[PDB]
Amino acid sequence: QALLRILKETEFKKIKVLGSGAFGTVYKGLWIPEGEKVKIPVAIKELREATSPKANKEILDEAYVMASVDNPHVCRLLGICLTSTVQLIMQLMPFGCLLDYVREHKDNIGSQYLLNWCVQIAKGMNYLEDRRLVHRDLAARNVLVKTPQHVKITDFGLAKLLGAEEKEYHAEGGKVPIKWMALESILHRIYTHQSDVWSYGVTVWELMTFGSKPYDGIPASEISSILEKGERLPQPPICTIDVYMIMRKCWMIDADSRPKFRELIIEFSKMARDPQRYLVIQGDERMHLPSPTDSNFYRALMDEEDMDDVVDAD
Amino acid sequence: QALLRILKETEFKKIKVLGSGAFGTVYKGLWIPEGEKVKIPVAIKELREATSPKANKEILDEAYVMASVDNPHVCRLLGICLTSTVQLIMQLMPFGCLLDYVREHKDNIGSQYLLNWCVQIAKGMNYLEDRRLVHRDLAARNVLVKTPQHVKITDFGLAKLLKVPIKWMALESILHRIYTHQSDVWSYGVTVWELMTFGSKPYDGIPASEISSILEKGERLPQPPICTIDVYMIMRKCWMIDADSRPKFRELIIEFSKMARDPQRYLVIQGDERMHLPSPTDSNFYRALMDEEDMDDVVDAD
Ligand SMILES: *CCC(=O)Nc1ccc(OC)c(Nc2cc(-c3[nH]c(SCCOC)nc3-c3ccc(F)cc3)ccn2)c1
Ligand SMILES: *CCC(=O)Nc1ccc(OC)c(Nc2cc(-c3[nH]c(SCCOC)nc3-c3ccc(F)cc3)ccn2)c1
Numbered sequence: 001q002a003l004l005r006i007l008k009e010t011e012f013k014k015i016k017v018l019g020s021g022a023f024g025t026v027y028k029g030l031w032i033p034e035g036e037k038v039k040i041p042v043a044i045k046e047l048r049e050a051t052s053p054k055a056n057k058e059i060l061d062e063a064y065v066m067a068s069v070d071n072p073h074v075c076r077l078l079g080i081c082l083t084s085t086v087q088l089i090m091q092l093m094p095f096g097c098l099l100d101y102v103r104e105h106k107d108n109i110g111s112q113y114l115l116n117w118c119v120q121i122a123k124g125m126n127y128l129e130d131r132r133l134v135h136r137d138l139a140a141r142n143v144l145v146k147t148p149q150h151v152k153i154t155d156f157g158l159a160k161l162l163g164a165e166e167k168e169y170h171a172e173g174g175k176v177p178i179k180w181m182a183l184e185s186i187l188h189r190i191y192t193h194q195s196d197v198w199s200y201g202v203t204v205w206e207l208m209t210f211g212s213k214p215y216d217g218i219p220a221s222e223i224s225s226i227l228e229k230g231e232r233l234p235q236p237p238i239c240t241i242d243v244y245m246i247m248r249k250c251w252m253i254d255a256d257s258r259p260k261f262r263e264l265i266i267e268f269s270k271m272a273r274d275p276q277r278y279l280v281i282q283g284d285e286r287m288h289l290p291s292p293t294d295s296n297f298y299r300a301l302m303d304e305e306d307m308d309d310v311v312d313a314d
Numbered sequence: 315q316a317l318l319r320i321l322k323e324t325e326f327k328k329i330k331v332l333g334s335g336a337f338g339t340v341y342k343g344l345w346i347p348e349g350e351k352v353k354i355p356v357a358i359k360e361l362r363e364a365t366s367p368k369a370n371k372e373i374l375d376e377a378y379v380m381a382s383v384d385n386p387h388v389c390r391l392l393g394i395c396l397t398s399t400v401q402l403i404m405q406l407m408p409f410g411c412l413l414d415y416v417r418e419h420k421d422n423i424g425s426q427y428l429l430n431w432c433v434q435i436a437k438g439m440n441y442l443e444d445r446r447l448v449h450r451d452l453a454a455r456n457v458l459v460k461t462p463q464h465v466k467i468t469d470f471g472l473a474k475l476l477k478v479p480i481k482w483m484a485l486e487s488i489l490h491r492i493y494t495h496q497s498d499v500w501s502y503g504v505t506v507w508e509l510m511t512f513g514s515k516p517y518d519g520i521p522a523s524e525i526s527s528i529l530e531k532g533e534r535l536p537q538p539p540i541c542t543i544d545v546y547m548i549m550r551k552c553w554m555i556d557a558d559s560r561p562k563f564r565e566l567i568i569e570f571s572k573m574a575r576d577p578q579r580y581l582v583i584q585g586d587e588r589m590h591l592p593s594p595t596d597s598n599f600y601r602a603l604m605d606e607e608d609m610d611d612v613v614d615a616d
C-alpha cells in the first residue's frame with residue numbers, strides 16, 4: 001500500500017539515458033518533491049509494452065508486489081508512473097551492473113569479491129523464493145552494484161508481467177534469455193524456483209569468466225539440442241573442481257536434483273572462508289576486501305542500509 | 315580509529331561553493347574512489363587559518379572525536395585531508411541548512427515539522443552532552459536538513475579547533491568565555507526562536523556590543539507570533555542567568571515530544587490545515603531514496 005509511490009509526470013524528469021534491455025530503457029532521472037527545489041537522482045525504467053492488453057489494475061498489483069520486497073540483496077521498486085506507458089522508479093546505483101563491473105575490473109577482482117557476490121546473489125534469490133517469487137531473468141546484467149562489496153538483484157517478475165512473443169523463443173539472440181534458461185523453460189515455458197537456480201549457475205559462470213558470453217557463437221535455436229546432448233558451459237580457468245561442480249549441479253536436467261538457494265548460500269559461504277582454496281587468481285593477496293576504515297567510509301556515504309556482514313577469510 | 319578515513323588530495327575534487335561561515339568555506343565535492351570510475355557527491359569544508367595554529371597531532375585527535383559521534387541527529391565527520399590546509403569531508407545534504415529552509419518555506423511549514431525539529435535537535439544535543447562534548451556554536455545555520463522530516467546537527471567541535479556569534483551566546487560565555495552544556499542550552503533556545511520566527515535574525519538592528527548589557531537588564535528575544543506561551547516559556551528558561559536553572563536537553567526532548575503530539579495546540583499558524591507530515595507512502599519513498607539510516611520514529615499528532 002504505502003510501499004509504492006504513485007508519481008505524476010510533473011514531479012520527475014528523465015535526464016540521461018543509461019542503456020536498455022529486453023524489458024525497457026533505463027534513464028538517470030531527477031525527482032522533484034512537490035513544493036521543494038531540490039532535484040534528487042533516481043533511476044527510471046520506461047518499460048516496453050506488455051504482450052497482452054493487461055488491465056492497469058494488474059500492472060499496479062504486480063508493481064505493489066515488487067515494492068514489497070525487503071532484503072539487503074534485492075532492489076525494491078519505489079515508485080511507478082502510469083500514463084499511456086509504464087515507468088518504474090527506484091534508487092540509482094552509480095556503480096552500474098555487475099556484468100559491466102566484472103568486465104571492466106577483470107584484472108583487479110580477487111576471490112573474496114567473487115565468492116561473496118555468489119553468496120549475496122544466493123541470499124537475494126533465497127528471499128525471492130521465500131516470497132514465492134520466481135525471477136525468470138536472473139543474469140549478471142540484472143545484478144546491480146550498490147558498492148563493490150554489496151550487490152542487489154533487480155528486474156524480478158518483469159518477464160512474467162510483460163511476457164514475450166513466442167517468436168522470440170526461436171529468434172537469434174533476441175529478447176528471450178535462451179542461453180540462461182533451464183531446458184524445461186526453453187521447451188515448455190516452465191518457470192520455477194529451480195529454473196531460477198539454473199540461471200543462477202549461469203550467472204556464477206559469467207562472474208567467474210569476468211563477463212564472457214555463455215555459449216558464444218552457438219545459435220539460440222540450437223541450445224535446447226546441445227543441452228539434451230549433455231553439453232554444458234566450460235570450466236572457467238580460475239575455478240577449482242569444487243566450484244565448477246556446483247555450477248554443473250545447477251544445470252541438471254532433473255530440476256529437483258539442482259541445489260536449493262538456501263544450500264548455495266551455505267556452500268559459497270564456506271568457500272569464502274578459505275577463498276584461495278577454491279579460486280586460483282594470480283595476485284590474489286593484493287585484492288582483499290576493504291579495510292574497516294574504507295568499509296565504514298563507503299557505508300556512511302553510499303550504503304546506510306543494514307546488511308549481513310561479508311564473509312572474510314579465516 | 316577506523317571511523318576516520320584520511321584522504322589524498324587526488325581522490326576528491328571541489329566542484330561548487332555551497333556557502334561559507336566563520337570556520338571556512340563549504341564545497342560540494344566529488345569523491346573518486348581509486349581504481350573506480352564513479353564520482354560520489356560529498357560536502358567539503360576547507361577551514362580558514364586557525365587563530366593560533368594547532369599541532370597536526372592535535373587536529374587529528376579532535377578529528378577522531380568528531381568521527382566518533384554516532385547519533386541520527388548529529389552529523390558524523392567521515393574523512394579528513396591534512397595538507398597545507400585542513401579539509402573535512404561529510405555526507406552531502408542536498409536540502410541544505412535548516413535556517414535557509416525555514417526562510418524559503420516561511421509560508422508553507424506546518425506546526426508538526428517545527429515541533430519535531432525541536433525534538434530532533436534536542437536529541438542530538440542530549441547525545442553530545444552524554445559524550446561530555448560541548449558544541450559552542452549551535453544555531454539554525456548549523457542544523458542540516460537530510461530530509462524535511464530528519465535534521466542533524468553539524469559543526470560540532472569546530473569552535474575550539476579554531477566571527478563570534480554573540481547573539482546566540484549565553485551571558486557567561488560573552489563575559490568570561492565559559493562554555494558548557496548549559497550554555498549550549500542557551501543557544502538551543504535561540505535556535506528554536508529562529509525556527510519559530512521562520513528564520514528571523516535575533517536582536518535585529520541591535521549592535522552586538524550592546525547584547526550583554528541588554529541581557530543583564532533582563533530583556534530577551536520576544537514571543538514569536540506563532541508561539542503559545544508553553545513554547546515561549548521554554549525559550550525563556552533557556553536564557554536564565556543561572557546556568558543550572560536552564561532546562562536539560564533530556565527534559566526538552568520530553569516537552570517538545572508532548573507538544574508534537576498535539577501540535578496545533580502549541581503553535582498557532584495561519585492555515586495550519588494547509589500542511590502536515592508526509593504520509594507513510596511519502597516517508598517510505600524519502601527513506602529508501604536518500605535516508606536509509608536508523609532513526610527514531612516521528613512524533614505525529616493525536
Ligand atoms: C547491466 C547494465 C547496467 O545496468 N548499467 C548501468 C550503467 C550506469 C548506471 O548508473 C550510473 C546504472 N545504474 C542503475 C541501473 C538500474 C537498472 N539496470 C537495468 S538493466 C537494463 C539497462 O540498464 C541500463 N535495469 C534497471 C532498473 C530496474 C527497475 C527500475 F525501476 C529502474 C531501473 C537500476 C538502478 N541503478 C546501471
Ligand atoms: C545554512 C547554510 C548552508 O549550509 N547551506 C547549504 C546549501 C546547499 C547544500 O548542498 C546542496 C548544503 N549541504 C551541506 C552543508 C554542510 C555544511 N554546512 C555547514 S554551515 C556553513 C555554510 O555551509 C554551506 N558546514 C558544513 C560542513 C561541516 C563539516 C564537513 F566535513 C563538510 C561540510 C555539510 C553537508 N551538506 C548546505
Ligand SMILES: [Cl-]
Nearest residue numbers: 021022023024
Ligand atoms: Cl531490461
Ligand SMILES: [Cl-]
Nearest residue numbers: 335336337338
Ligand atoms: Cl562555518
